[PDB]
């Protein structure tokens, strides 16, 4: 018998690739996720498979922030306008605190 078929797919190896305080470079993937568990914050970009990568080079920090969706996101705006008064939604966000300056001014000529 055993009419149950399929379900032989392997693990996706998803999750956090860069924890708190880890030095990160530009383009390094911070987290891979099937659903929006961790949200993009400052200097963290999102790729179309909801992946999180570092837009700048620095230190990864995980914070907890209020959640204000885009007024075009219909499902989110419906949830917000169906949320009772006095309640603010919270999500977990990932930031990269940039370590270096953008550049330096230095002497090149004595004209």
């Amino acid at each position: 018998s055993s009419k149950n078929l399929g379900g032989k797919s392997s693990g996706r190896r998803q999750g956090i690739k860069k924890m708190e305080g880890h030095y990160v470079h530009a383009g390094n993937i911070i987290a891979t996720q099937r659903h929006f568990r961790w949200h993009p914050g400052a200097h963290v970009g999102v790729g179309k498979n909801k992946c999180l990568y570092a837009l700048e080079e620095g230190i990864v920090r995980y914070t907890k922030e209020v959640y204000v969706p885009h007024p075009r996101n219909t499902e989110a705006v419906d949830l917000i306008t169906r949320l009772p008064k006095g309640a603010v939604l919270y999500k977990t966000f990932v930031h990269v605190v940039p370590a270096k300056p953008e550049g330096t001014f230095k002497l090149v000529a004595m004209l």
């Binding site: 018998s1 055993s2 009419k3 149950n4």
Partner: protein, 50 residues
């Protein structure tokens, strides 16, 4: 359940006693395979409820 129900209903006084269950009805399904069947070949069909 039938043993308890019959014994308590027979032995009680229906004018001065009252009895209630604190245990729900049989809900967990217990499955049994066919007799003489070797090991494997899927999970057996549901036999009763506990």
């Amino acid at each position: 359940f039938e043993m308890m129900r019959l014994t308590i209903n027979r032995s009680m006084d229906p004018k001065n006693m009252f009895a209630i269950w604190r245990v729900p009805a049989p809900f967990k399904p217990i499955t049994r395979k066919s007799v003489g069947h070797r090991m494997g070949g899927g999970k057996g069909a549901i036999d009763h409820y506990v």
